[PDB]
Amino acid sequence: QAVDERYRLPTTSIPIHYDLHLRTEIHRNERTFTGTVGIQLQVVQATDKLVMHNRGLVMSSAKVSSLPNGVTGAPTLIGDVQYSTDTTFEHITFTSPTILQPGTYLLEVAFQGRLATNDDGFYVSSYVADNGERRYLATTQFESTSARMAFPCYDEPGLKATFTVSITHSLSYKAISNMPQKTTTDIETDMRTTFFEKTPAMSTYLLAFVVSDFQLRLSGAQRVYVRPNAFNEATFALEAGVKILKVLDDHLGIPYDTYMPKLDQIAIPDFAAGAMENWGLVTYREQALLFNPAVSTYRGKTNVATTIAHEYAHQWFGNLVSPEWWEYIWLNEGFATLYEFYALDMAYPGQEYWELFNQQVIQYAMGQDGQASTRPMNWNAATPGEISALFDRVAYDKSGSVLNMMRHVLGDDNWKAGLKAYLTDRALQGAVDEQLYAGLQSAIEGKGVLPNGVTVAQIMRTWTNEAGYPVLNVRRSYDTGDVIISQERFYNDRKVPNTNIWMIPYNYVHQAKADFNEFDDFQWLATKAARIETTVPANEWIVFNKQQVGYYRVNYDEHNWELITNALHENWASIHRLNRAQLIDDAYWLARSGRLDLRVALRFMTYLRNEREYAPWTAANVALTYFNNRLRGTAEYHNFLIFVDALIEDIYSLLTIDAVSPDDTLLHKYLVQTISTWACSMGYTDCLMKTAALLKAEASGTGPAVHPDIASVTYCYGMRSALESEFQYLYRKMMNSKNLAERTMLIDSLGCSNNKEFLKAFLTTALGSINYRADERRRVVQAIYSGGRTGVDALIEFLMDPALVNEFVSTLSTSTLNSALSAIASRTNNVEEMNKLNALITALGSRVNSQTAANLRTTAQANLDWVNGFEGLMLSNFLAEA
Amino acid sequence: QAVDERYRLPTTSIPIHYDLHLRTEIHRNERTFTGTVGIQLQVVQATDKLVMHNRGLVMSSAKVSSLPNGVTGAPTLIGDVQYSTDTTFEHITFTSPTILQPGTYLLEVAFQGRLATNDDGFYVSSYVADNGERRYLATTQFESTSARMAFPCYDEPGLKATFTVSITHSLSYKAISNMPQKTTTDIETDMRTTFFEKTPAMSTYLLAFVVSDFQLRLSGAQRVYVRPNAFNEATFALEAGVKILKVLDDHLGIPYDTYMPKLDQIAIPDFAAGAMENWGLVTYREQALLFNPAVSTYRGKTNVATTIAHEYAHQWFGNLVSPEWWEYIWLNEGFATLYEFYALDMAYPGQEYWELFNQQVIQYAMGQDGQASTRPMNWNAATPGEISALFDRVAYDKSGSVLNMMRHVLGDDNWKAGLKAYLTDRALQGAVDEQLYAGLQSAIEGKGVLPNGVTVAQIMRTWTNEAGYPVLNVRRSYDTGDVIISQERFYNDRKVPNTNIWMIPYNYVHQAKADFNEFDDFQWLATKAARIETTVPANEWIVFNKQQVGYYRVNYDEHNWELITNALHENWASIHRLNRAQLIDDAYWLARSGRLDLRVALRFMTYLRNEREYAPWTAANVALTYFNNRLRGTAEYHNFLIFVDALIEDIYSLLTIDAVSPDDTLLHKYLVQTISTWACSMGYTDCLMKTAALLKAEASGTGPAVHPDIASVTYCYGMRSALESEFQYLYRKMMNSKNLAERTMLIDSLGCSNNKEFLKAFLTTALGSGTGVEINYRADERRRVVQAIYSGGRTGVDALIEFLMDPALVNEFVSTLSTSTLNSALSAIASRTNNVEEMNKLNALITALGSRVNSQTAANLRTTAQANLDWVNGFEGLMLSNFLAEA
Amino acid sequence: AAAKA
Ligand SMILES: [Cu+2]
Ligand SMILES: [Zn+2]
Ligand SMILES: [Zn+2]
């Protein structure tokens, strides 16, 4: 029972080829644009009217002709046509004097638009040159449904067509697009038309072009475009692109050049998403592509590397094979998320990029997918808002986690084969759910890799058509040598019976034979529950999900939880580190949902004293963060600090001062960042003094710049009780950087001062007009409240003053005000803070309506209440160590 | 005996040319602005001091020079000058060390101001972009006396001068002005100066410039500027401007491009009037220029079209030829009002736009002009308030009606020729009323179109220098059969003899020969009364004013009123529909003034059962509305509903459910709106259920959006007993619209709920702001919500009273809207109390409000309320209700 | 696309 709509185009007519010409004088900051399009189309059901899409465009003329011999051959003028647009369905209808009969026709429309300023259609972007002058560029973003903002078209992904694009623009600017340049022609006194080669069959949402004065770096058939003053930061992207494209060529067994003679990447200063996979011309926001080793962090580099991998994966999964309709958008975004980490790991083996997948995708997916509002992977949509809303954690991380599950179940070679079958089959066409299963099946037909009578499709449908994921319960009738397992839907929040039955692949491992590295032994639960007969002593632990490859949580009897717990106390590395990470996150969420005694889960985490690897500590960091945030303003908070001190103080035998030795790995860097972060949060004076000194050493001249891989921590803590000269130094550094990611990190870092007078002055700089972008001014507010309770207070004190909320609201919106109020609410934990909040609401007067005020109080009250709820009592209790 | 003043500038000096430069950084929301002006002027009477205007400006320096060889020759520094300004007369005086002798001089002032926020001088406006950011722009409105707020000048319309304007602003913004761009020049790191070509001779009130990040669309020598996210709503305006400008060029025989190489139109988000005719750069409030066929009504489209036609008319009547002084402001606003409809009809022939003139202008003008307070067209003024106050129904609709009268009396070709003579004569200069009469006369000199003794001026002076208008009485001698006619001034209120004698053009038409379409037979009454000898049988009716072209009402003896009445019962279309409309409105007002037996007028209206056209029903609507409002809360009300139910139910054989077929005319649309609006007001369950379903169909998904041309009705009534989902739907739809006219219509529509809890919550939204990314009302819109609620019906008044009983609620109410808004709503409530039971509610409120209300205002409310309660037992009110003894 | 972190 999913009702949708009549927002779908009439099915009477169908595109064949678009011949698009656009003119823009964006070099002059002229923001109108003009266009003509010649659309070759097929009529299937005889009609008087051709219906396609338009948002915002104003037609000036239109006419039709027939093509009596196909697409080559001459047209014969039928007549001028009538145009009208429905603003709600965004259907434009061209109406002929005659009724057209099933054949090939040529529609020709002249039209005029304007460049968006919300980063969505054909829009404007800009940057500031080294001499202070602002320079404009026109660029595109169509995915979802915005190709209709640049030219009238059949804007649905299943209606693939060829595209021949030409653009008129300033002689002094360059145009690029999906396809290579076919030819320049200078015109008038000032201008030029750039012509592009015809595309293959593709969807409108992937069409793209850019008109700018940018520069390129290159290597063979691949370039990277950047604003001229970012040229030195484009080297990494070009390396990564070459390596990643090749890995994918080989692995999938279809080279990219099978269909395209070049692949460009471009960094666009104003960009809504992280990046967009337009065939042959992939757009990025700057933070997703630029890297500068003097100031960019290992995290930043990882973001560039994964994003490139993500969008290159789309050249096959999305571009070559596109979704028939958005219901199957996971066919794109699931594979892109998986290969975001997998292709990258194949492209830089030994940098342990693939480890990042378990915490950044699997566990991340389970968090959102444990909510009652989560959707099934297959889920339809009709309106533009409904379509955007599909681009969520289910389309991305969930899909990517289940695909990773399938990949392991099928085996590497079968997997590759399956995909090559799929891609080959649906090449230059649309795909749905079942066509993928067909492909994967073919590569294992007769090979007896699945139990007899079971399809690839039988399995995937249980995961694809059902919201959420299961928890697999494992109960042992111990001293008696059996195990019972059973499955129910997992919620973060509640236990609610569910009729659907996931076909779940499982395996398991016991204490004497502790091998987690093979995947030959996959078993299936295809019913609600089952008895597993077995060999294992009541003294040995068992653990079910090998390296958390299966997309499900696992719960055990308190017995087996305690066996496990003991085993990791005596020898902390006795279980695979990903499985330790599974146990940590599983225990955490099982306790929160009330499927497991909190006391048990907390007992299980004491083992971390001895822990030394990246995955488990990353998992732990999420549980600890939650507890930290709920205890913070409360009396019991001291005992939490003590408890966590106990957990880390050992592993705090790393180097955080100068951490960076050339030999320490990616994973090490993450680990160092997580542990030092905690130590500094807790006020380890060693941590606070070293960071403080480093910053002082760089701001003073005494010493070198702080290495980027340690800057996040060092600049934030280190600023805690720093003096005016170090605050100003860091502030001037940010204002002089032309690097967005740097700027953001420094804005956050300034936010960590404990000095309320610094914070308020800092906030004042974000108001009025220094060179913040809008997003950065908002960022300053966020830095201040995210710094700690002292910034929150600084912010509240600021907003109490009515003249100050006046300035605040005139330069940021009221939405930024309501946003900050929510943030403050999320961080009030005690009576004294609740007073401060209520005082602010009241002081703000007519800016806060009753509804919102009620909401703020509600989220704040939930925090105060939390301290004496069952959780919270259970926890304050447990923190009665002695 | 009209006493005025010394607010007029000294007459010693006179402007020649202004050289104006202004700088604004409004792109940054900086609201200060700086300027320099170089004023070439002539001294006529030797003086030590040059007096001109200033409101709000602060001078920083000033000096004078002489120009011995004129305006081309070189200046020779005389000295720095002293400045002082009188706040009351708004005169700034520059005093020279030397006494200047009759010649040409150059005054040079530097000064600084600040942008207004009441939409009046050089002021600030703003909009929200497609990315949620708020964008500012600087813009102008000078008419009346506000040019003095942007630069020191001789701010009187008779002191025409040339203007050369330049503006410094952000490289990322554009400046436009009266004249075309002469050249850009980039400066500093981020700013630019835009230079404009020199204007012709023109008045200061017509100068204009706008600094914004707007966009243009174009067609030939014309553009329309809009905020970037309104780009597609600008289409109609650009079409209409091209067509209308050409009609006027041909019709007046002086092309616009005789004086100006381009004409821009711009839609300004914050704008006090509807529009302003600045030569070459016409400003509009968005509702007067934007049109979007998906949501805009046919009314909305008509407002745009008439407004463009109105303001383009001014390019000749106001700009090329300007009033010598505001006493003759009708020289502008009369012609603009006439051509508001006439040029538009010529531009879109067959859309029956000209029909709208009789009800929207003529009858509308007579309503106000029948009051004892009305002014003569020629009427002088001195203070800024007195000048604004002249921009009233006499300057606009009355003048426009008499000009229409003259036009028909002179004939098209003579009229055209006359106007061309006028415009040509006074081109680039000031005009007074006599110069117009000269022009019109010349085009008919010797042509014997007027009787022997008589000038164009002789006639027009009777209409121009006298308050009000006449009623022409026609008393019949049925047998002989002769007719006597006579004229007296018409009042709405009273019958009082008057000594002045209008020179009145008349004609007439009788039942056998029923032709109302020619205007060759014009006759004149130039005395108080006259005997008309004639041929017409005592059985045939006569009717005097052909298509109500003459600006006068007409009364008949009761027998003729009864002949007429009978004739329209047998064949409702036997008389020209404009004349039916005349009779309806005349009968109505004659009865109200006690010049005619109410019983007769009511008897005459019964013919409406069979009526089927736009004009008469629009007329009827006014009479019916009045009776409806007086009877509403009263016992006799039932009998009124019956009586009207009789009048419509026939014509309620239209489609209101889905009314809109592509072949329905403009006039049909107005008609459908007027009829269906009555049926729904009365509770026709067919009407109430159909509108309700439509609104449901759209708010559900079940069905289409309601077509705009019936949204007004459908969204209001269909909301009557609608549920929370339809109310919330329409409410969210209003919140998300960025279209001001749409928003207003939806605010009114939500107002029509009968659910008092909805209404109060609704009102609550207008107080304080809204939730999250959510959007709020403009100030004008908040006020609009209050008005929607009380205008919705007695239930919304009751909801509003209950709201204001709560003291904490009047507190919020008053902090975000004025106390002035409170009193205003109180008066509105008082106007709508017609019951003891309502009087009780009112008195309870007054008392509940306590110290918010003083004695005077509490007395007043009771007074107006009491005036209602009393009406029921006046002679009118007893005469009526009585007449409501149907059968 | 790739979303924003
Ligand atoms: Cu300012
Ligand atoms: Zn006007
Ligand atoms: Zn993607």
Short mmCIF file of C-alpha atoms in Angstrom, two decimals, chain B residues 201-378:
data_model
loop_
_atom_site.label_atom_id
_atom_site.label_comp_id
_atom_site.label_asym_id
_atom_site.label_seq_id
_atom_site.Cartn_x
_atom_site.Cartn_y
_atom_site.Cartn_z
CA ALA B 201 12.94 69.08 -19.14
CA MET B 202 11.03 67.42 -16.39
CA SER B 203 9.74 67.78 -12.87
CA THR B 204 11.63 66.58 -9.83
CA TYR B 205 8.76 64.33 -8.72
CA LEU B 206 9.32 62.10 -11.76
CA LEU B 207 13.03 61.44 -11.21
CA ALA B 208 13.81 57.86 -10.36
CA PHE B 209 16.59 55.37 -9.93
CA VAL B 210 16.96 51.85 -8.59
CA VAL B 211 19.99 49.97 -7.41
CA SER B 212 19.46 46.24 -7.27
CA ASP B 213 20.44 42.78 -8.34
CA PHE B 214 17.26 42.37 -10.35
CA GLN B 215 16.96 40.92 -13.84
CA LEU B 216 15.47 42.17 -17.06
CA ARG B 217 13.42 40.70 -19.85
CA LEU B 218 12.98 42.66 -23.02
CA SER B 219 11.33 43.46 -26.26
CA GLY B 220 12.63 46.28 -28.47
CA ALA B 221 13.04 49.56 -26.59
CA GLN B 222 11.21 48.15 -23.47
CA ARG B 223 12.31 46.02 -20.47
CA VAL B 224 10.64 44.59 -17.32
CA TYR B 225 12.78 44.24 -14.24
CA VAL B 226 12.07 41.71 -11.55
CA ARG B 227 13.69 39.98 -8.63
CA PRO B 228 15.44 36.95 -10.04
CA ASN B 229 12.96 34.44 -8.62
CA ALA B 230 10.00 36.25 -10.27
CA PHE B 231 11.44 36.01 -13.80
CA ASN B 232 8.68 33.92 -15.31
CA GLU B 233 5.87 36.09 -13.92
CA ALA B 234 6.94 39.08 -16.01
CA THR B 235 5.66 37.90 -19.39
CA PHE B 236 2.30 39.54 -19.48
CA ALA B 237 3.62 42.93 -18.44
CA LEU B 238 6.11 42.97 -21.27
CA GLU B 239 3.47 42.08 -23.88
CA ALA B 240 0.99 44.64 -22.51
CA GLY B 241 3.55 47.41 -22.36
CA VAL B 242 4.45 46.99 -26.01
CA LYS B 243 0.86 46.92 -27.24
CA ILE B 244 -0.36 49.78 -24.99
CA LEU B 245 2.55 52.10 -25.80
CA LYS B 246 1.81 51.73 -29.51
CA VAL B 247 -1.92 52.40 -29.17
CA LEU B 248 -1.11 55.61 -27.32
CA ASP B 249 1.55 56.67 -29.88
CA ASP B 250 -1.01 56.37 -32.70
CA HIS B 251 -3.99 57.62 -30.84
CA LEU B 252 -2.31 60.77 -29.48
CA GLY B 253 -0.24 61.29 -32.63
CA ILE B 254 3.01 61.89 -30.68
CA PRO B 255 5.17 58.88 -30.33
CA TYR B 256 6.80 58.28 -26.95
CA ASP B 257 10.13 57.91 -28.81
CA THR B 258 9.75 61.55 -29.88
CA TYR B 259 11.28 62.23 -26.44
CA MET B 260 12.64 58.95 -24.92
CA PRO B 261 14.73 56.03 -26.38
CA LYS B 262 13.43 53.43 -23.90
CA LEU B 263 10.78 52.60 -21.30
CA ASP B 264 11.42 50.30 -18.32
CA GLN B 265 8.93 48.73 -15.95
CA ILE B 266 10.03 47.38 -12.59
CA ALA B 267 8.31 45.38 -9.86
CA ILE B 268 9.28 46.66 -6.42
CA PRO B 269 8.52 44.33 -3.46
CA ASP B 270 7.87 47.24 -1.05
CA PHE B 271 5.74 49.86 -2.66
CA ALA B 272 3.07 52.16 -1.11
CA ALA B 273 0.86 53.05 -4.12
CA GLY B 274 -0.08 50.63 -6.87
CA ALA B 275 2.47 52.20 -9.24
CA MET B 276 4.35 55.42 -10.18
CA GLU B 277 4.75 56.84 -13.72
CA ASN B 278 8.40 58.05 -13.52
CA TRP B 279 9.35 59.01 -17.04
CA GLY B 280 11.15 56.02 -18.64
CA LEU B 281 11.11 53.96 -15.41
CA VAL B 282 7.70 53.04 -14.10
CA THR B 283 7.56 51.37 -10.69
CA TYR B 284 4.96 48.89 -9.62
CA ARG B 285 4.03 46.99 -6.57
CA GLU B 286 4.33 43.31 -7.53
CA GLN B 287 0.55 42.77 -7.52
CA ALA B 288 0.25 45.44 -10.17
CA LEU B 289 2.73 43.90 -12.59
CA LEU B 290 3.35 40.19 -12.00
CA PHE B 291 1.01 37.57 -13.36
CA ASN B 292 1.28 33.85 -13.18
CA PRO B 293 -1.58 32.02 -14.88
CA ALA B 294 -1.34 29.06 -12.51
CA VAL B 295 -2.49 31.14 -9.50
CA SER B 296 -3.38 34.66 -10.56
CA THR B 297 -7.05 35.59 -10.98
CA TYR B 298 -8.64 37.30 -14.00
CA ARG B 299 -9.07 40.21 -11.56
CA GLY B 300 -5.37 40.13 -10.89
CA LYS B 301 -4.69 40.13 -14.58
CA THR B 302 -7.02 43.06 -15.03
CA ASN B 303 -5.25 44.98 -12.28
CA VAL B 304 -1.94 44.55 -14.06
CA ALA B 305 -3.33 45.58 -17.42
CA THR B 306 -5.19 48.65 -16.25
CA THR B 307 -2.26 49.75 -14.20
CA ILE B 308 0.18 49.59 -17.09
CA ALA B 309 -2.33 51.42 -19.24
CA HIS B 310 -2.78 53.99 -16.47
CA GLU B 311 0.93 54.69 -16.01
CA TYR B 312 1.80 54.66 -19.72
CA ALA B 313 -0.91 57.29 -20.23
CA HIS B 314 1.01 59.47 -17.79
CA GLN B 315 4.08 59.51 -20.12
CA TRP B 316 2.12 62.16 -21.97
CA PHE B 317 -0.34 63.36 -19.26
CA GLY B 318 2.01 64.10 -16.40
CA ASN B 319 5.52 63.78 -17.78
CA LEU B 320 5.66 65.54 -21.15
CA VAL B 321 2.90 67.84 -19.97
CA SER B 322 3.00 68.29 -16.17
CA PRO B 323 0.74 70.29 -13.82
CA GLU B 324 1.99 73.84 -13.23
CA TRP B 325 0.98 73.21 -9.64
CA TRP B 326 -0.98 70.52 -7.73
CA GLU B 327 -4.20 72.51 -8.00
CA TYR B 328 -4.41 71.01 -11.50
CA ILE B 329 -3.37 67.50 -10.54
CA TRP B 330 -6.48 66.17 -12.29
CA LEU B 331 -4.72 67.14 -15.53
CA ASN B 332 -2.70 64.05 -14.83
CA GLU B 333 -4.96 61.68 -12.93
CA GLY B 334 -8.11 62.31 -14.94
CA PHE B 335 -6.53 61.38 -18.22
CA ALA B 336 -4.74 58.42 -16.68
CA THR B 337 -8.01 57.11 -15.29
CA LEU B 338 -9.81 57.44 -18.62
CA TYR B 339 -7.02 55.81 -20.58
CA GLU B 340 -6.61 53.22 -17.80
CA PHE B 341 -9.58 51.61 -19.61
CA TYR B 342 -9.69 53.23 -23.04
CA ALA B 343 -6.09 52.59 -24.21
CA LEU B 344 -6.31 49.09 -22.78
CA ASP B 345 -9.50 48.37 -24.75
CA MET B 346 -7.72 49.65 -27.88
CA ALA B 347 -4.81 47.37 -27.09
CA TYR B 348 -6.93 44.26 -26.46
CA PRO B 349 -10.09 44.83 -28.55
CA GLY B 350 -12.83 42.24 -27.93
CA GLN B 351 -11.79 41.56 -24.39
CA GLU B 352 -14.50 43.87 -23.24
CA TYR B 353 -12.23 45.96 -20.92
CA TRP B 354 -13.99 49.24 -21.71
CA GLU B 355 -17.26 47.93 -20.21
CA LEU B 356 -15.61 47.97 -16.82
CA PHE B 357 -15.40 51.74 -16.95
CA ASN B 358 -19.05 52.47 -16.18
CA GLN B 359 -19.18 50.64 -12.87
CA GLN B 360 -15.55 50.95 -11.82
CA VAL B 361 -15.18 54.62 -12.60
CA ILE B 362 -18.41 56.49 -13.36
CA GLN B 363 -20.70 55.01 -10.73
CA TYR B 364 -17.83 54.69 -8.35
CA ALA B 365 -17.14 58.45 -8.79
CA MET B 366 -20.77 59.50 -8.21
CA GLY B 367 -20.82 57.64 -4.86
CA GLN B 368 -18.16 59.82 -3.31
CA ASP B 369 -19.04 62.96 -5.25
CA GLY B 370 -22.56 62.91 -3.74
CA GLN B 371 -21.19 63.82 -0.39
CA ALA B 372 -21.15 67.39 0.90
CA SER B 373 -17.44 67.13 1.66
CA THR B 374 -16.45 66.52 -1.98
CA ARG B 375 -14.12 69.04 -3.64
CA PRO B 376 -14.17 70.69 -7.07
CA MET B 377 -11.65 69.30 -9.59
CA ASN B 378 -9.75 72.62 -9.37
#
